[model samples]
Target: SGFRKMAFPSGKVEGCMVQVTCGTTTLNGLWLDDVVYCPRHVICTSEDMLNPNYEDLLIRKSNHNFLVQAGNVQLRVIGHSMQNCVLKLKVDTANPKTPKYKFVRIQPGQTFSVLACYNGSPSGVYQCAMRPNFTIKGSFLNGSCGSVGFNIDYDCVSFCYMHHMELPTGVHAGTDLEGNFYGPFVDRKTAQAAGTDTTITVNVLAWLYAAVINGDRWFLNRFTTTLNDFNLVAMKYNYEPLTQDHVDILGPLSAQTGIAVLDMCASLKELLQNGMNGRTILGSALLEDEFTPFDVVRQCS
Candidate 1:
């Protein structure tokens, strides 16, 4: 074995000359060969978007049934008779903005995987769609097979305790460890377990209207205020992302412990007259026990 590990830390090895041999003779020769090659491609057509050797590509998925517990299902693919081939997938996780653009490198028998989320569709019922998903609209992004792009759309199920209808109160969108977007419910376990039906939205509407409309200073100053923290936490560390550096550039830039939760109470004071005619008459609002919408705000400190 004349092979010894060589470190190529000169710079980014992109579309990088990467290779591994399989045959016993060729496998050993792979390490012995020192001729480094840099491969490049421009995905400019449908043919290039997806390497012509479509037969060599195999895409597989993982368990989606554990969505609630294990996060999301994973989309995986392996390529045979392909190298330095780049492929792009237009993934949408209901990501508020531009769905999401994901890219994968296609290599022989080499597997690439992406965590996939579900959208409500098919079988009619929003929650009915299972690990079932499909892709669509394939096109090339560059001039070669390695660099390709496809506008892929997948539909999966991710229902909630609340009805399919939107929640009456609008809250800041936040991601959990699992990357699911949800609102600030003051009580999660309690409200989530309550079950969903026709009145959930109306109940939420009435609940918010009752509190915000009623000027329950206790609810307003306490419950509603949690939103500021959510907004602030996201804001406080935004400069974070440890982009290329968490290199605390102190003194060079003004820094602080937290963003001030400005009190909007005064501006609201003039108009937040209690009890809007909105859902008052419908007193038996669906979610009455879990009193605060802030129930979702902070799961922890």
Candidate 2:
């Protein structure tokens, strides 16, 4: 038989339409579509997966139902649903223009858990655009430090440990070849766009670390004197975490460089956390420093 536009059973998502080329799978017991294409005795079909009744088959969701968005520091979800259709699989955030919220498919007795998150980066207040529902046996919010709810992979494997508790960095304590995060970014600034002295130091710490990680020592040697200035900033802000127990970030860098290297960015352009927010945090001079500490290596611990 000749090929035709593929179809999924009732209530299945028809992502992108993939046509059957000249393959016999479509006609010879075949069912095919954009998400999946399988061949029955002959026709290429995406339906009737597992040779079971369509109603009992469960569709699969994308690998990650949860993601961390930089904008407004909120969570993001690319909604997906289920099927006997075995419909399609796709990264949702990259394409969030779907018409409605859909539920994932599961068999009659199969167990499933639903974790809901809505990222409203578009409006100043970040919130989920659509709240997908799920029926799990139990559900509760941790509302604790350990579960920042920013679930990341391996929490940094290079400097990874099985005990992946939250660290001073607001992320789990760990290190990889590069940064601690990898995800779709909407924005990185808060309503307080201008960063903090702590924020500046945090970034400078990164630039400084990169110098050694990449083996750029000339400026580091030159900037070492300047590097000493960060200590002043840290102490001024009473970033007790970085200043008290931590003398410098050089320990790990020196080991990485096999040489002592340091650089501190003093220029406001190179160091201001809130240039747009007046290059400063507007309130809480007496209390801002108490909490909200940043350190790659926790200081108080």
Candidate 3:
């Protein structure tokens, strides 16, 4: 059945806060399956598929028996609504006598928990399926599920495989009052170098080239060890009348730098051309306009 909207308003009834609703009766107490809540409305399966189907679900196939390496492996599943849902997991090994697959239930959301220990005998593609309980299906009215398979690198000595371990610990990245990464010396050295008379000409040309490649205004106000120095040095050499490589890099650099400069100039021109008299003329007019109003009063005499 199709989905219909229902509205519920808050009210107090007998010392208890109750949610009262006045809306279509079609969606009342009925299970709305395969539904996802988006910006505008709650979309249902017949409306659209918010997640991939069983066939499109990412399942990592392995050739080694899981039992032998099960202790060393870990599985991480990612899904929006399927966090705490239990999965009906299965592994397909083709050989019935020596089953290559194993089955277990898992709650994917709480922590990276172990699903099944590969006994080193099962080796093949593992299949995982999840079914929400009848109670939840009825209560929530509608929801969608998705699944992904990750190959556990049992050989990896580091615990970096865990999501929380992605970044180094204890290094607090700071932010400004508005939660921006702004500081006085963000790229002090780079800014100084870029503004230098000697470097400005070449750097501007390099920026132009970058702008062309990226199809946007390219300007660097910060210096990172990896990108900032390498690019600046490359641009300096490119503009210098040197070797064949320099000449080759020059065309691309020029195209990029020109595009950047043009975009910046365009933006500057727009700012300057907007409003009356431009800033230079407007400042002078402001003084005259204020004095003229007083002068006209006296001239009346």
How do all models score by TM-score? 0.16, 0.24, 0.13
Deviation from native of the Cα of residue 77 in model 3, angstroms:
18
Task: Looking at model 1, report the run of 10 residues with the lowest lDDT sum.
Answer: 23-32
The sequence of per-residue lDDT tens digits that candidate 1 reaches over residues 98-147 is: 22223222211111111111121111111010010111111211111111
The TM-score that candidate 1 achieves is: 0.16
Best by TM-score: 2
Per-prediction count of colliding residue pairs? 24, 26, 13
TM-score of 3: 0.13
Stretches of candidate 1 above 4 Å error? 1-98, 101-121, 124-206, 210-285, 288-301
lDDT of each: 0.20, 0.24, 0.20
Error of 3 at 189 (Å): 38
Error of 3 at 274 (Å): 21
Positional deviation of residue 116's Cα in model 2 after best superposition, in angstroms: 8.8
> What RMSD, rounded to one decimal, does every model reach?
22.2, 20.8, 26.5
Q: Write the per-residue lDDT of candidate 2 for residues 241-276, one digit (tens) a residue.
A: 234223244356446445443333432223333232
Our tally of clashes for model 1 stands at 24
Better of 2 and 3 by lDDT: 2
